[PDB]
Design a protein around this motif. Sequence first.
Motif, PDB file in Angstrom:
ATOM      1  N   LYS A 680       0.809  -1.210   0.000  1.00 20.52           N
ATOM      2  CA  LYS A 680       0.000   0.000   0.000  1.00 20.52           C
ATOM      3  C   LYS A 680       0.846   1.265   0.000  1.00 20.52           C
ATOM      4  CE  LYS A 680      -3.965  -2.063   2.341  1.00 20.52           C
ATOM      5  NZ  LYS A 680      -4.549  -2.435   3.658  1.00 20.52           N
ATOM      6  N   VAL A 751      -0.224   6.585   6.907  1.00 17.31           N
ATOM      7  CA  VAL A 751      -1.403   7.439   7.084  1.00 17.31           C
ATOM      8  C   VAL A 751      -2.117   7.685   5.755  1.00 17.31           C
ATOM      9  CG1 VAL A 751      -2.210   9.654   7.961  1.00 17.31           C
ATOM     10  CG2 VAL A 751      -0.426   8.394   9.137  1.00 17.31           C
ATOM     11  N   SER A 753      -2.044   5.624   3.380  1.00 16.90           N
ATOM     12  CA  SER A 753      -2.290   4.309   2.792  1.00 16.90           C
ATOM     13  C   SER A 753      -3.728   4.044   2.399  1.00 16.90           C
ATOM     14  CB  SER A 753      -1.849   3.228   3.779  1.00 16.90           C
ATOM     15  OG  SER A 753      -2.088   1.934   3.278  1.00 16.90           O
ATOM     16  N   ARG A 754      -3.915   3.460   1.222  1.00 19.29           N
ATOM     17  CA  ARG A 754      -5.248   3.103   0.743  1.00 19.29           C
ATOM     18  C   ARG A 754      -5.132   1.698   0.170  1.00 19.29           C
ATOM     19  NH1 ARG A 754      -7.936   7.808  -2.818  1.00 19.29           N
ATOM     20  NH2 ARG A 754      -9.666   6.320  -2.612  1.00 19.29           N
ATOM     21  N   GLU A 755      -6.115   1.272  -0.610  1.00 19.63           N
ATOM     22  CA  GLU A 755      -6.092  -0.072  -1.181  1.00 19.63           C
ATOM     23  C   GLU A 755      -4.928  -0.255  -2.154  1.00 19.63           C
ATOM     24  OE1 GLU A 755      -7.756  -2.176   0.267  1.00 19.63           O
ATOM     25  OE2 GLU A 755      -9.648  -1.305   0.928  1.00 19.63           O
ATOM     26  N   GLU A 763      -3.967  11.944   4.348  1.00 19.11           N
ATOM     27  CA  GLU A 763      -4.510  11.598   5.663  1.00 19.11           C
ATOM     28  C   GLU A 763      -5.864  10.900   5.557  1.00 19.11           C
ATOM     29  OE1 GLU A 763      -2.813  15.422   7.284  1.00 19.11           O
ATOM     30  OE2 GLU A 763      -3.817  14.663   9.081  1.00 19.11           O
ATOM     31  N   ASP A 764      -5.901   9.836   4.760  1.00 14.93           N
ATOM     32  CA  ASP A 764      -7.094   9.011   4.635  1.00 14.93           C
ATOM     33  C   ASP A 764      -7.165   7.914   5.691  1.00 14.93           C
ATOM     34  OD1 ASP A 764      -9.433   8.849   2.734  1.00 14.93           O
ATOM     35  OD2 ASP A 764      -8.788   6.755   2.662  1.00 14.93           O
ATOM     36  N   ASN A 765      -6.083   7.681   6.425  1.00 15.63           N
ATOM     37  CA  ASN A 765      -6.046   6.658   7.463  1.00 15.63           C
ATOM     38  C   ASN A 765      -5.390   7.243   8.711  1.00 15.63           C
ATOM     39  OD1 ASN A 765      -7.449   4.552   6.328  1.00 15.63           O
ATOM     40  ND2 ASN A 765      -5.635   3.484   5.550  1.00 15.63           N
ATOM     41  N   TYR A 767      -5.812   7.473  11.724  1.00 13.37           N
ATOM     42  CA  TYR A 767      -5.725   6.744  12.984  1.00 13.37           C
ATOM     43  C   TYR A 767      -4.725   5.598  12.936  1.00 13.37           C
ATOM     44  CZ  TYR A 767      -9.805   9.365  14.511  1.00 13.37           C
ATOM     45  OH  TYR A 767     -10.670  10.371  14.872  1.00 13.37           O
ATOM     46  N   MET A 768      -3.911   5.515  11.884  1.00 15.48           N
ATOM     47  CA  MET A 768      -2.829   4.544  11.848  1.00 15.48           C
ATOM     48  C   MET A 768      -1.597   5.010  12.607  1.00 15.48           C
ATOM     49  SD  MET A 768      -3.519   1.708  10.007  1.00 15.48           S
ATOM     50  CE  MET A 768      -4.988   1.179   9.135  1.00 15.48           C
TER      51      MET A 768
END
Length: 1102
Positions: A680, A751, A753-755, A763-765, A767-768
């Motif tokens: 990812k 942070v 990271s996506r599919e 900042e799509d994730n 809370y990582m």
Amino acid sequence: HSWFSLFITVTILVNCVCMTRTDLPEKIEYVFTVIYTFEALIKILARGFDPWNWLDFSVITLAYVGTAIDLRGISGLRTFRVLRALKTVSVIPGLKVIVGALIHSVKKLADVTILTIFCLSVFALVGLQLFKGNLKNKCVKNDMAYSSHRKPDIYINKRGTSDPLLCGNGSDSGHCPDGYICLKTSDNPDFNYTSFDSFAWAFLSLFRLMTQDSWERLYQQTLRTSGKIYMIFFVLVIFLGSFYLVNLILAVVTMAYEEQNQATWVKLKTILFGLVTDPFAELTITLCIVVNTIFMAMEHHGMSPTFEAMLQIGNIVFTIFFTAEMVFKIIAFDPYYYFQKKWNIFDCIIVTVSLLELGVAKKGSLSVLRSFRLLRVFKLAKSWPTLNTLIKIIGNSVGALGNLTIILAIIVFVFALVGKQLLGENYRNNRKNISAPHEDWPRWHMHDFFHSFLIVFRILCGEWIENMWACMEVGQKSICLILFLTVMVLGNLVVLNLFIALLLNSFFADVGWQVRKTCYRIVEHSWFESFIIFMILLSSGSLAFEDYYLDQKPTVKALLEYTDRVFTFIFVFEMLLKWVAYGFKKYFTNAWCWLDFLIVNISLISLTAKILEYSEVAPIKALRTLRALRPLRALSRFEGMRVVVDALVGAIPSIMNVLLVCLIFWLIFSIMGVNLFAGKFWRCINYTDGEFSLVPLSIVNNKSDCKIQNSTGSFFWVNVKVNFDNVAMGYLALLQVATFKGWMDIMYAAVDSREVNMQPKWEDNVYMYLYFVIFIIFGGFFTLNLFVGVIIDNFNQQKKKLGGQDIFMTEEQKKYYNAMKKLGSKKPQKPIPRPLNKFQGFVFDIVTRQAFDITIMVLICLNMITMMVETDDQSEEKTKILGKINQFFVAVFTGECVMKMFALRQYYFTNGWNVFDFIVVVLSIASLIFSAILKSLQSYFSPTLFRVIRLARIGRILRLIRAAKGIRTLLFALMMSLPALFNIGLLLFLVMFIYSIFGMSSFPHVRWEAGIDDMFNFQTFANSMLCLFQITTSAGWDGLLSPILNTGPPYCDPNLPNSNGTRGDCGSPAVGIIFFTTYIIISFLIMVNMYIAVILENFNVA
Ligand SMILES: CCCCCCCC/C=C\CCCCCCCC(=O)OC[C@H](COP(=O)(O)OCC[N+](C)(C)C)OC(=O)CCCCCCC/C=C\CCCCCCCC
Ligand SMILES: *[C@@H]1O[C@H](CO)[C@@H](O[C@@H]2O[C@H](CO)[C@@H](O)[C@H](O)[C@H]2NC(C)=O)[C@H](O)[C@H]1NC(C)=O
Ligand SMILES: CC(C)CCC[C@@H](C)[C@H]1CC[C@H]2[C@@H]3CC=C4C[C@@H](O)CC[C@]4(C)[C@H]3CC[C@]12C
Ligand SMILES: CC(C)CCC[C@@H](C)[C@H]1CC[C@H]2[C@@H]3CC=C4C[C@@H](O)CC[C@]4(C)[C@H]3CC[C@]12C
Ligand SMILES: COc1cc(NC(=O)c2ccc(-c3ccc(Cl)cc3)o2)cc(OC)c1
Ligand SMILES: *[C@@H]1O[C@H](CO)[C@@H](O)[C@H](O)[C@H]1NC(C)=O
Ligand SMILES: *[C@@H]1O[C@H](CO)[C@@H](O)[C@H](O)[C@H]1NC(C)=O
Ligand SMILES: *[C@@H]1O[C@H](CO)[C@@H](O)[C@H](O)[C@H]1NC(C)=O
């Protein structure tokens, strides 16, 4: 009453979380107030039938009146609320004892700051003298053709960054490209906050260097603007600045902490068969745990479908087996007995989570839950004592030391909320100034609670000055200074207290025989030994001439060819002579003669290939690289290095086991990281010329789309160099987070990271981050405590085995140590005889009194204050006035010295302090005339040497340590500990030299990227040495590993037009990975040993 108190406790708990939450709907606060004013009314009724509570009531009433006019606003009201909400938290019975303990820590540290700030001021004055106005140097273009500056000064940006390039006019400083000349500008590098132009800026820079926060950045800037030689400055300072102060902070707290705690039918058949459980079942359970661990540690981005299917089948089989052991054990014991053990509940919850995952099986569904099975490795602790010890450390941290964790968490929460409320609106209305070129938000801001907590945690990791620069550019500077300085100091204090406590508490609670005789006599003689030492030194030194530019020197290369063959002949003969002299059994059972034999064997094989026609073959070209092991022969001879290595070898067995447990613990984290982030981290970049820019998600959102839109040829799909795609690479990623260098790059990718095969989004994730936080808290933080504790008790047992004899010092260093110890304790020296002569007697009467001494100290303090007012580009008149003041001071001190000499004739020269001021006085007089003579009658040499000549005024400043007892004592302790630091530094220098040889033979070609530039590279001995010193403290080691981790375009030219040796701008990832990691581990072990030595020295002195 009790119910009144419990109402108070819950409402404040609501506020803790209520302020944590933004966008209050102006209905929650109202419901809270109605309640608090009712409680205040009943409290008033009780009171009629403390002043702080009265003040709180007044504040709440003021807020109630202020809702009509200028509602909300200011900044302070929320911060006033939290203190009242915090008193209840503070009331916990155990917290008060802990804070009382901590106050002692700051009272003990008092003496250390008295010395810390003195040293920072002295070296800040030195830095101001040397480097004022040099960080303002920039590469400015020329003109083609006059009023002021021709247009704005068009600078150039260093490759890979937008910062203006810093240069110098010296030979070893740094040069501009063609069409660029150095000019001293008015703007400073970072945000105009990094400088040596005034005492304030210099003190800030030296405090940054003391904590080593991004200190490598200032290192490179000053060495690039002033000259490579000034690295020595940065060497002498960095060590005393960081290492020495920590030596004290730790010792001075550790003893203190110790001090305080020194003060204190068919069911029956099933039950039978369950009790039939034998040790042969436990081995099966452990075997299943290990095989499941290895199967889960076999995941990667490139799994084949059959590979994934087999892993899935294996995982299911194991989960079924563990459910089977559950159903067997429950119907073996009774569930009430079963649910009484602590491990049984742990096993039950893990297997329950495992079964739940088996039920709701979506591809990616709560991947964190897929890694709880890894927790079963903790069951492999009832037979492994070390894993149990780690668990004991964590449990001691939670239960017995819980109050320290509570106060640390409360400090982090309170400071994060306070900073969020004070600085929050600023980070949203000013976000353009501190954001990256193409981004629209800073990565570390304080608008919301999560990011404020992240900034506080990052400060707790030692990275504070960059965020401070960001906040001073968005809000008020004073608020940033107060907030960041208090957070750093207070948080580091609490963290060190928690760390030391945990270590202390958990860990410590016929003709042939004649020829042989003649040869033995020849070998034993000292001259032969010195000859061999000289040959080893020459052989090592000749290796430092084989750099990138040797191919341009034709004679030097030929000379070395002869030098290396004659040296090979010498040592082969020496081995032959020793073999005849000692005998075969004595030689081959020495563990040093084996090292000499192997090195000579390698050299002989290389020479034999050179004489033959196998110089170009693959493996011989790899044995030629092991010519960097020749300096170890010097390690063999010298006794101090032998003593240090002997200690290292004695320690190694425990570091092996501790290392194994660390690897097991990290392996868990790496499996989790692969489950989360594997594959990812890929993203498109636009590479045009040494600079890459992330392709925005609007024009390109999919992998496929870069190929479709790659008309230009500038768009590349790339992966981060260090990542969680593979488990082995994952350990390297974890290591970077633990070292705190390169940790950020890995996190930003996670942070975003996506599919897989999907463009990363800003900042799509978000809370990582927590994952990394948990790692830092649990992995590096718990493991390092275990590592240090094991090293300490190993040291204790080893020194007890010696008989308590101090290690790391040669036998003659022991005699020097004893003499130096006896030196410091002699109180009486006898009164000095009164002068017979009336005039000499009167001068004696004047000089012998304490008033003269106090006058001299206050005069030196005035001189110091006069020296702190020097600034770059100040004025002509100011410079002349300061020069006249300095002349007055030097005349006064010269006269005073003469008077002392007249009063004290030979007694003066008897005392050492007197010798010391005499020397400083002579140095000042020599400096003053020397500077004048070159200017007046000699060709104008470089001004930069004048800047060095006026460094003789600092000696008068150091004259003050005569007066202070603590500083003198600390200095004496350092002096006592110098002899062992000498041997350990000799070992460190040898290691660095060998690494430099390895890097200079293996890494010079690498493309200039990140840390690697035209000055900090591996093309010369000095350049490699600079790089090695920088990474000795682990600073910026990812910056040097990054270019070596490049294995193709757009970072490499596959063949290149000009490169016979590597045929690419490529670097070797395995070699580089091995080379960088090994050095940091070795350096960390050596520096831990130096900590141990100097801290033991401090304990003996105190
Ligand atoms: C990678 C690294 C590369 C290499 C880096 C370079 C390493 C440099 C290392 C060290 C340099 C400084 C070390 C020496 C410091 C000497 C200070 C000193 O020796 O003084 C202390 C003695 C104490 O005597 P006490 O009666 O108080 O007993 C004390 C009572 N008990 C027994 C309880 C302790 O005093 C005396 O022996 C009086 C006799 C001595 C008089 C002259 C000595 C002082 C001269 C200069 C000192 C300046 C030190 C500057 C340090 C840096 C500051 C920024
Ligand atoms: C990659 O992402 C793009 C954008 O989401 C996909 O293109 C869209 O596909 C839908 C399918 O119904 C269309 O309605 C949109 O108008 C398309 N938008 C465009 C052209 O950007 C694309 O199909 C995805 N797949 C690939 C090629 O990887
Ligand atoms: C959420 C995951 C990743 C973290 C690890 C699970 C933690 C929070 C849980 C799961 C099982 C729990 C343990 C089960 C056994 C006991 C009982 C008692 O003897 C002490 C607490 C202790 C030791 C618990 C501590 C917390 C614990 C370890
Ligand atoms: C009673 C006496 C012997 C107890 C002494 C405890 C000492 C040795 C403990 C307490 C805190 C510990 C230090 C804490 C932090 C660090 C930083 C690390 O990078 C090197 C190890 C080092 C320096 C530790 C060394 C050991 C240490 C100094
Ligand atoms: C010049 O004299 C020295 C100074 C230091 N100084 C340090 O400040 C330091 C801080 C952090 C680390 C460190 C942290 C992590 C790892 Cl993996 C490795 C190192 O080192 C260390 C020395 O040891 C050789 C020598
Ligand atoms: C560097 O030297 C050039 C002349 O070659 C000079 O014009 C320039 O000002 C110098 N800069 C500094 C700060 O020395
Ligand atoms: C940010 O830049 C603007 C100009 O666009 C300026 O007015 C402002 O002062 C800058 N930020 C701060 C905190 O000064
Ligand atoms: C991207 O590449 C093109 C050339 O193909 C260049 O003109 C453009 O400015 C580049 N943009 C970025 C974002 O770097």
